[PDB]
From a paper:
Interleukin-1 receptor associated kinases (IRAKs) are key players in innate immune signaling that mediate the host response to pathogens. In contrast to the active kinases IRAK1 and IRAK4, IRAK2 and IRAK3 are pseudokinases lacking catalytic activity and their functions are poorly understood. IRAK3 is thought to be a negative regulator of innate immune signaling and mutations in IRAK3 are associated with asthma and cancer.
The asymmetric unit (ASU) contains 3 molecules of IRAK3. The αC-helix of IRAK3 is in an inward-oriented position with an intact KE-salt bridge formed by K192 of the β3-strand and E212 of the αC-helix. Another hallmark of an active kinase conformation in IRAK3 is the intact regulatory spine (R-spine) formed by L227, L216, F312, C291, and L309. The presence of this evolutionarily conserved cysteine residue in the R-spine of IRAK3 suggests the possibility of a redox-based mechanism that controls R-spine assembly. The hydrophobic anchor F177 thereby leads to a rigidification of the G-loop and keeps the loop ordered in the apo-form of IRAK3. The dimers are formed via a pseudosymmetric “head-to-head” arrangement with the αC-helices as central elements of the dimer interface. The interface is flanked by two disulfide bonds formed between C202 at the start of the αC-helices and C287 of the αE-β6-loops.
Numbering used by the authors:
A (entry chain B): 152 to 184, 188 to 196, 201 to 319, 328 to 452
B (entry chain A): 153 to 197, 201 to 319, 325 to 331, 337 to 450
The structure:
């Protein structure tokens, strides 16, 4: 519980110095009472629909693996959303090791890979009408001081039971083919985007590889186990951390490939993604 | 508040506590902590359509406040049951008051125009909110509640839309203009058309559809009176349940209700112009 005047001077009148980042339709600030506030960036036709979907899901749906909405402010012709600040920051920031931080151990990886997996199952089976997260990525997964994950960016979340202009630019590299070439946003578009972030925690590489040709990490691993070999995928395992059992590594490449499939019918559901993902956690420690 | 209070004060949502059943919700009466409230429950029972309307209620009630809009005091998401609770307005809905359902004292004119002004103030507020203009799309004499001091409160924003000149896939429409019915077009001027119906419904005290065998509508009847025999005949349909109002008063409201319910949307006046007319005609009373 806070007031607007606490934020007005707290964010130093939205000072450019007190900014954590500017995303698609927001520009996140840092506030202390510490919090992170998302200020509505003002074509309201589509930007406003997103701000709604964000506040819709957070108020109506709660889960320990979802960044909990603290409060909302609609005052002084300004809309904004306040959030509890995450100490570990973005997943993408920690497994890429920005700021020369410590790499993520394998047990935390499979830990926050299950945590996010548990939430996306919760959302796919909400009672009124199932909701599709849509914009899931290693950039929208935050980690607290205990390194436990939190979802973000429910702006392109849709309820289910179809327009490419409505897309999120940064989330392009996670979208399936039926979403791009056919516009069909399915229930299985989250398991697709989740199979890619499994690849990102197995191989500490970026979403799109920095090679001169600028090829996708999905397509690279898509061709290794398709032609060369399943163990050839293991050549790209993140070397910044000590090794892990070959059965733990194999089961995750086996799963990520089935999740990040072009054809939608052959793509699994989050429950069995979570079943195979918790059993893999035992293969690590044994 | 607490959802445990609601489930008790409604007796597991028993039939004896519902005040009315809307198309997509269920309204119940709940009294907790020496105060009474009106809970409105999602008609759980397709999925996608009814759910979107649910969000329309919650969005505009949390983002936009005005003295002439029924506040949302709490909302609950637990036990898969999604309900909205409202401060119970003890003077019922405008419709029930114009019809004197419980043999209530019929509304005097000064209250009748106070209500018209209050609702026009709220609709003006919504049409000019900063992020995107919101249009109500569900104005009715049954969606206008009256507090203890007979001050109008606007409800039922389930059909509301955010506009930057719009469209609605069409898949009991007595207040909607001919472009919404025939062409699906819905706009800011759609509210003023429905607001004109209310002015007609306030002046006459009649129902929107007259309870006769042929079921002729109100505006269609008043149209005939004003086109054929002019404004002098419209004044014969003033509400006889209350003493006569000044002719200058009643004459300006009929002309106003005529423009507000103009058949073609291009001509209908902006809600700002209406509030100006409603204020200057209260002085004439
Ligand atoms: Hg692979
Ligand atoms: Hg008339
Ligand atoms: Hg007149």
């Amino acid at each position: 519980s806070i007031s607007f005047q606490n934020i007005i001077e707290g964010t130093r009148n939205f000072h450019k110095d007190f900014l954590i980042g500017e995303g698609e339709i927001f520009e996140v600030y840092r506030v202390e009472i510490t919090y992170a506030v998302k200020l509505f960036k003002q074509q309201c036709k589509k930007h406003w629909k997103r701000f709604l979907s964000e506040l819709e899901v957070l108020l109506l749906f709660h889960h320990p693996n979802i960044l909990e909405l603290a409060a909302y402010f609609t005052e002084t012709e300004k809309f904004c959303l306040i959030y509890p600040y995450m100490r570990n920051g973005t997943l993408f920031d920690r497994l890429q090791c920005v700021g020369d931080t410590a790499p993520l151990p394998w047990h935390i990886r499979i830990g926050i890979l299950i945590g996010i997996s548990k939430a996306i199952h919760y959302l796919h089976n909400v009672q009124p009408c199932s909701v599709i997260c849509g914009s899931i990525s290693s950039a929208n997964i935050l980690l607290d001081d205990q390194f436990q994950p939190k979802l973000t960016d429910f702006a392109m979340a849709h309820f289910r039971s179809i327009n490419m202009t409505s897309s999120s630019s940064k989330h392009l590299w996670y979208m399936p083919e039926e979403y791009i070439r056919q516009g069909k946003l399915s229930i299985k578009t989250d398991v697709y985007s989740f199979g890619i972030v499994i690849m990102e925690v197995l191989t500490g590489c970026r979403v799109v590889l920095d090679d001169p040709k600028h090829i996708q990490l999905r397509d690279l691993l898509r061709e290794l186990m398709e032609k060369r070999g399943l163990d050839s995928c293991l050549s790209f395992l993140d070397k910044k951390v000590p090794p892990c059992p070959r059965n733990f590594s194999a089961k995750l490449f086996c799963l990520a490939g089935r999740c990040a499939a072009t054809r939608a019918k052959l793509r699994p559901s989050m429950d069995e993604v979570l079943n195979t993902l918790e059993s893999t956690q035992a293969s690590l420690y044994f």
